[PDB]
């Protein structure tokens, strides 16, 4: 690791890779080709599954294209396919909208084995706990 050189993150969903209307000339304009953003992405995207948001570094030098090392998705969008509503917050803490528990979100915290600042496999539990409380979700631990 070093520091800064080139990297961003502006997408919506892996369901529709390399979009044009949502981002377009905004998905990259520094050394990133708008059409070349559908080759190295789907080379591993369509390799597992599409749907969940997938941001990534944009290591850019001066050698034509770019190289992005992807990792883990937002643990906040995991409440539209694996929890409840299609939305999220909307009506935060004015009424007990949604409610998850200790059971759920477990194997959701388990997937991020290379993305957790807590060697304690137990400490890295309350981290996503908030990631499912940023919209008004009570926890039935």
């Amino acid at each position: 690791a070093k520091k800064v050189q080139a990297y961003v993150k502006l997408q919506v969903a892996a369901g529709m890779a390399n979009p044009s209307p949502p981002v377009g000339p905004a998905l990259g304009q520094q050394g990133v080709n708008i059409m070349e953003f559908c080759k190295a992405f789907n080379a591993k995207t369509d390799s597992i599954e599409k749907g969940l948001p997938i941001p990534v570094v944009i290591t850019v030098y001066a050698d034509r294209s770019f190289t992005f090392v992807t990792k883990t998705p937002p643990a906040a969008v995991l409440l539209k396919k694996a929890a409840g509503i299609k939305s999220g917050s909307g009506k935060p803490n004015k009424d007990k909208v949604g409610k998850i528990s200790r059971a759920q979100l477990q194997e959701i915290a388990q997937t991020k084995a290379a993305d957790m600042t807590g060697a304690d496999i137990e400490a890295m539990t309350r981290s996503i706990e908030g990631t499912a409380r940023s919209m008004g979700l009570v926890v039935e631990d």
Binding site: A1, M116, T117, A119, D120
Partner: protein
């Protein structure tokens, strides 16, 4: 913070990390980055953990007046800036190398590794400890005795004797 009480506290704990401690490393940290924490704590994910601490407490007057847990020769070990590294569980091995190869990558000065406790004295980084649970170094250490040290001298003439 707090006063004399908060003082003693950090010490008795930080210094019980030297009494009940498995190991001890003293590393001056000029230009210490947060990447610094991002390292000894990364080397804690899949190789260490919370069995290690490193509170920059060159408070000296603190960490030092507070080693009546028996830490002599450490007045000499109290110069300039330092970041005390103390072990509780696990072997004393690996922890040393971590800094040894950190600071050597630049990662801030290493205070020339002024050495620390466990054996108890001065400066001179050795490699006793890290060679453990790699006893295949005692497999390779036997040097086949009769055979490897054989096929190296008893059998090295031919490949270098027909001169």
């Amino acid at each position: 913070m707090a006063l004399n009480l908060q003082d003693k506290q950090a010490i008795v704990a930080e210094v019980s990390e030297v009494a009940k401690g498995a190991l001890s490393a003293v590393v001056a940290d000029s230009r210490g980055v947060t990447v610094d924490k991002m390292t000894e704590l990364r080397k804690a994910g899949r190789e260490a953990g919370v069995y290690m601490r490193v509170v920059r407490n060159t408070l000296l007057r603190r960490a030092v007046e507070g080693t009546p847990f028996e830490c002599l020769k450490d007045a000499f070990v109290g110069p300039t800036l330092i970041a005390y590294s103390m072990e509780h569980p696990g072997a004393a091995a690996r922890l040393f190398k971590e800094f040894a190869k950190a600071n050597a990558k630049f990662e801030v000065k290493a205070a020339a590794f002024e050495g620390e406790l466990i054996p108890a004295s001065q400066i001179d980084r050795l490699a006793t400890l890290p060679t453990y649970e790699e006893a295949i170094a005692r497999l390779m250490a036997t040097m086949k005795e009769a055979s490897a040290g054989k096929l190296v001298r008893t059998l090295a003439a031919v490949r270098d004797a027909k001169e």
